Amino acid sequence: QVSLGVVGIGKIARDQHLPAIDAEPGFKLTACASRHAEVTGVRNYRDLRALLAAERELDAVSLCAPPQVRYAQARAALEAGKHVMLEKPPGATLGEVAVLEALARERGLTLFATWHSRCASAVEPAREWLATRAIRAVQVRWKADVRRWHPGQQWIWEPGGLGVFDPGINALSIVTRILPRELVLREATLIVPSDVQTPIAAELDCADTDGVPVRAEFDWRHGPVEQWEIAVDTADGVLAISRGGAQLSIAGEPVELGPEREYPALYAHFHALIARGESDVDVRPLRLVADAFLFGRRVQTDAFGR
Amino acid sequence: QVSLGVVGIGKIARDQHLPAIDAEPGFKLTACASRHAEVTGVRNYRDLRALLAAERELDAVSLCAPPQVRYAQARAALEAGKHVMLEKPPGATLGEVAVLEALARERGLTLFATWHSRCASAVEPAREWLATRAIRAVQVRWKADVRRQQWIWEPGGLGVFDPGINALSIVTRILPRELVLREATLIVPSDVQTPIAAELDCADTDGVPVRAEFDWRHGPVEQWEIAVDTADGVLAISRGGAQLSIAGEPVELGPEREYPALYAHFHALIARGESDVDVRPLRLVADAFLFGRRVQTDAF
Numbered sequence: 001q002v003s004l005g006v007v008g009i010g011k012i013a014r015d016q017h018l019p020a021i022d023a024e025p026g027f028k029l030t031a032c033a034s035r036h037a038e039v040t041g042v043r044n045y046r047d048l049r050a051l052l053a054a055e056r057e058l059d060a061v062s063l064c065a066p067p068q069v070r071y072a073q074a075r076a077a078l079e080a081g082k083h084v085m086l087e088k089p090p091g092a093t094l095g096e097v098a099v100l101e102a103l104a105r106e107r108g109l110t111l112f113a114t115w116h117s118r119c120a121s122a123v124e125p126a127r128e129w130l131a132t133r134a135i136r137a138v139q140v141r142w143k144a145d146v147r148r149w150h151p152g153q154q155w156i157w158e159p160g161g162l163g164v165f166d167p168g169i170n171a172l173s174i175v176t177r178i179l180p181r182e183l184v185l186r187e188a189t190l191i192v193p194s195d196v197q198t199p200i201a202a203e204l205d206c207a208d209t210d211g212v213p214v215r216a217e218f219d220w221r222h223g224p225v226e227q228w229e230i231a232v233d234t235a236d237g238v239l240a241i242s243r244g245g246a247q248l249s250i251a252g253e254p255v256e257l258g259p260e261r262e263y264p265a266l267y268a269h270f271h272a273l274i275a276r277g278e279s280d281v282d283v284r285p286l287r288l289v290a291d292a293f294l295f296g297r298r299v300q301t302d303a304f305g306r
Numbered sequence: 307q308v309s310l311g312v313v314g315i316g317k318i319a320r321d322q323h324l325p326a327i328d329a330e331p332g333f334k335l336t337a338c339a340s341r342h343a344e345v346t347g348v349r350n351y352r353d354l355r356a357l358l359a360a361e362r363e364l365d366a367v368s369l370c371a372p373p374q375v376r377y378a379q380a381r382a383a384l385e386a387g388k389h390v391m392l393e394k395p396p397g398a399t400l401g402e403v404a405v406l407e408a409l410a411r412e413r414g415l416t417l418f419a420t421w422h423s424r425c426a427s428a429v430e431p432a433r434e435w436l437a438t439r440a441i442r443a444v445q446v447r448w449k450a451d452v453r454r455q456q457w458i459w460e461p462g463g464l465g466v467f468d469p470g471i472n473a474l475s476i477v478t479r480i481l482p483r484e485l486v487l488r489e490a491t492l493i494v495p496s497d498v499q500t501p502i503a504a505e506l507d508c509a510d511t512d513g514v515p516v517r518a519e520f521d522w523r524h525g526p527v528e529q530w531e532i533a534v535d536t537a538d539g540v541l542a543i544s545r546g547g548a549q550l551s552i553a554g555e556p557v558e559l560g561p562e563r564e565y566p567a568l569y570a571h572f573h574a575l576i577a578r579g580e581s582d583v584d585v586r587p588l589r590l591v592a593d594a595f596l597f598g599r600r601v602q603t604d605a606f
């Protein structure tokens with residue numbers, strides 16, 4: 001087995017990480033660090049520093065805290081000689097991810113920047129179908145009510161919190177995996193409530209290296225049903241990914257998919273990378289979000305209920 | 307020797323690029339493309355596509371247009387099989403630069419993202435002195451007046467980072483370790499889309515703090531200074547990289563020859579079959595736009 005610690009036991013750690021870890025036989029959950037939470041059955045620490053000081057035989061760490069603290073935790077873990085798995089986004093900046101990757105590679109440790117939506121069941125079938133087809137246009141719609149999905153959450157509205165790009169980067173992680181050629185931003189518009197530092201809605205217009213337009217709309221003002229869809233117009237008809245990757249239709253006919261197992265897949269891949277002594281750090285989804293903040297127009301909107 | 311074309315004949319093409327080229331025999335200036343200017347003594351085209359179609363013995367091209375149009379020109383030149391030299395910054399977005407870099411590497415072609423400030427005379431001596439020494443802190447002071455031009459105030463125009471990135475290209479060159487942004491503040495006037503002033507709080511991979519202030523407002527000081535405090539005293543760079551003090555003792559520097567040095571390195575890159583694409587100064591600015599708190603001030 002491989003000994004594993006989990007840091008920051010909040011929403012996603014309880015809903016997805018811990019169940020996935022238990023079912024993965026290659027990992028033995030050994031310790032957990034969290035300031036306000038405890039995981040029964042394992043040793044518990046209030047912060048990562050104390051966990052790392054006491055858990056010297058521990059092999060790997062998985063971080064599920066907000067991204068603003070991701071660099072410090074990941075650096076501390078790699079400095080102690082642990083393999084590191086990162087929730088998305090892999091960092092608050094691009095420089096800190098490059099620094100962590102160089103650090104991991106010099107120590108021969110595994111760094112894994114995860115993108116859970118890439119493991120949605122529709123992603124690989126869509127990728128295989130699109131590899132050898134003339135793509136004409138790409139449309140992305142990613143809208144959901146923030147108050148139903150992140151109630152009371154505050155770090156999403158602070159610098160480094162991405163705002164609507166926090167789930168929006170899930171769509172971009174899928175888009176950059178299913179399209180055969182790289183993206184480049186042409187324009188962006190970020191809509192920012194006057195009481196927060198991150199956008200609540202955004203519009204991205206990119207093109208692949210052959211000029212295929214890629215239009216994307218993100219919004220956190222929405223009704224109670226999500227719209228998480230990606231539509232790829234092809235000379236053979238439209239490929240339509242919906243429900244965040246759990247539903248796929250090709251040329252108007254539905255495609256049967258295996259059940260959604262995003263986080264088991266992630267942890268199976270984390271284990272494989274450790275065994276191979278390899279890293280997996282793809283920053284292209286965050287690089288595009290950075291280009292949107294760097295190049296995009298910023299428009300103000302009325303305040304949000306925080 | 308290497309046949310060369312120049313695209314975008316503006317003032318600094320006239321003032322810096324062409325004199326630098328005419329003074330190094332390693333290059334043969336063969337053609338120039340530009341819509342509103344012609345260069346005596348060589349063939350002239352109004353755009354790069356016409357130049358690339360006509361000049362088929364051409365080896366390389368140096369691009370001097372603004373970065374917003376440079377990406378399409380750089381792509382076309384690389385598909386044509388030409389070595390490419392870029393003015394700074396190497397792109398409007400980091401995605402643009404990554405695409406060019408993969409395209410140049412795919413064709414075995416030389417791609418050179420230049421930072422003319424890195425060729426200032428103080429830069430290499432400062433870097434050689436700091437490589438071995440225990441650095442404690444770094445401060446960057448950049449202040450000037452903007453009223454003594456509209457693309458700078460528009461989405462992707464960078465604002466005060468348009469000149470400010472030159473200081474960042476020297477900082478990232480002389481320091482022995484990479485920088486991570488920990489905090490940034492961008493002060494944007496309410497009638498524009500880019501910062502007039504900004505501060506960057508960074509740390510290197512050893513925790514050394516690196517602070518950088520940029521300001522374009524009216525004020526008492528016209529300032530460009532980089533101060534690196536070490537266990538052996540303060541290394542100080544002033545006058546845009548033309549002046550160097552080590553431990554309070556001034557250091558004698560040669561004359562400014564930024565663009566001759568750039569073109570000499572381009573030729574050496576082509577001879578070695580190498581490229582030189584350092585995007586870290588732009589990656590830092592993008593991190594500031596991504597991670598920085600934004601603050602409003604009165605209209606410009």
Ligand SMILES: NC(=O)c1ccc[n+]([C@@H]2O[C@H](COP(=O)([O-])OP(=O)(O)OC[C@H]3O[C@@H](n4cnc5c(N)ncnc54)[C@H](OP(=O)(O)O)[C@@H]3O)[C@@H](O)[C@H]2O)c1
Nearest residue numbers: 008009010011012034035036037064065066067069087088
């Ligand atoms: N929720 C989702 O839908 C979802 C899905 C997939 C991925 N993700 C990603 O996974 C990450 C975590 O998301 P989340 O929904 O779980 O948010 P969260 O619940 O607010 O954060 C999880 C835990 O991180 C700890 N935390 C907060 N501030 C901290 C700080 N300065 N230092 C150390 N720990 C701190 C907290 O644990 P303690 O107070 O006990 O220390 C918190 O319970 C995010 O990057 C998110 O984007 C989220």
Ligand SMILES: O[C@@H]1[C@@H](O)[C@@H](O)CO[C@H]1O
Nearest residue numbers: 116144149150166167170
């Ligand atoms: O963080 C996002 C969350 O906002 C939700 O909308 C869907 O996927 C998660 O990764």
